[PDB]
């Protein structure tokens, strides 16, 4: 089967603000990737092997709102630009890639999967460039190999004149390293 | 929810249609030059290409368009009228081989359906099944480029 994805908004602006302050989210969770927000920005978080990982430049050291109140981060690595919380009950985790493929597929916050060709352990190029605005909000999103396994988490875009042609990502290897750190 | 693939029917038979780039495409051998039904009345084809066995009307309601493939992958996936996915290895411009041959019945009524790549993007439109004695082992398809060109 091919990689297909769909998105669902489970909460609005005002419910989000209350939940941020409250720290208690009673909503049911589903999916591998969570659309996430702070009072300042919205991005993505990917559940891999039981841990909900996201980009440190988006989450900082914040707790994640859960049905039992705020949950402290399990891993924080400013250097790796990673933070991880226990995956929410209801989410499904992706498993790391084990095929060394160089044809990755970035899943965006709009649930579009775009092809990128690996050009190093932390970079790949879009086979079809898109406006930087189209990639905004996708930090922390997954880069999948042809089998649907996590190869990395989108971090930054290499763009010019407002068009991104490449993407910088955090390889899963840095996740395992961060866990033992 | 909106669909990319419409399960269509004509008096003679039923088959599929796939929305790509705002156009609902299907096979001429199924629709011919027939018009498509709508709440406002029959809407005519925007493109009719008897040669390529390709016809297209503007995308209907409750539909959403599929993105053309740009990764050149040859690990294709055919989707049937029953929503079954069938792995297909691309043999050429308009040819592909099932990784596991199935009876023609299994691929029956799926013409017009999409031939997807690993990213779920449209590679081609299922033209016809190539079967040896009732078992389809391959498929014939219209590449998205033909659609891109035709429009």
């Amino acid at each position: 089967a091919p990689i297909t994805a769909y998105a669902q908004q489970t909460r609005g602006l005002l419910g989000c603000i209350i939940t941020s302050l409250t720290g208690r989210d009673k909503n049911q969770v589903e999916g591998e990737v969570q659309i996430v927000s702070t009072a300042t920005q919205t991005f993505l978080a990917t559940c891999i092997n039981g841990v909900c990982w996201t980009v440190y430049h988006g989450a900082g050291t914040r707790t994640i709102a859960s049905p039992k109140g705020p949950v402290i981060q399990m891993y924080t690595n400013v250097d790796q630009d990673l933070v991880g919380w226990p995956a929410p009950q209801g989410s499904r985790s992706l498993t790391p890639c084990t095929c060394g493929s160089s044809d990755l597929y970035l899943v965006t916050r709009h649930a579009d999967v775009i092809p990128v060709r690996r050009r190093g352990d932390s970079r790949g190029s879009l086979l079809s460039p898109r406006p930087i605005s189209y990639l905004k909000g996708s930090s922390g999103g997954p880069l999948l190999c042809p089998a649907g396994h996590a190869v990395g988490l989108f971090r930054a875009a290499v763009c010019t004149r407002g068009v991104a042609k490449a993407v910088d990502f955090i390889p899963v290897e840095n996740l395992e390293t961060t866990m033992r750190s | 929810v909106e669909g990319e693939v419409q399960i269509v029917s004509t008096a003679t038979q039923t088959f599929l249609a796939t929305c790509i780039n705002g156009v609902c495409w299907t096979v001429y051998h199924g629709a011919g030059t027939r018009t498509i039904a709508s709440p406002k009345g029959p809407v005519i084809q925007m493109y009719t290409n008897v040669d390529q066995d390709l016809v297209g009307w503007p995308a209907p309601q409750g539909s959403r368009s599929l993105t053309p493939c740009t990764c050149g992958s040859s690990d294709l996936y055919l989707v049937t009228r029953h929503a079954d996915v069938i792995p297909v290895r691309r043999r050429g411009d308009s040819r592909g081989s099932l990784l596991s041959p199935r009876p023609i019945s299994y691929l029956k009524g799926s013409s017009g359906g999409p031939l997807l790549c690993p990213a779920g993007h449209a590679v081609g439109l299922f033209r016809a099944a190539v079967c040896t004695r009732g078992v389809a082992k391959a498929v014939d398809f219209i590449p998205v480029e033909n659609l891109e060109t035709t429009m």
Binding site: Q8 | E4, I7, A11, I36, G62
Partner: peptide
């Protein structure tokens, strides 16, 4: 005759 839509397929399996 006219081609009529008798059903739809969502590739992502979206329930919504």
């Amino acid at each position: 005759g006219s081609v009529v839509i008798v059903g739809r397929i969502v590739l992502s399996g979206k329930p919504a």
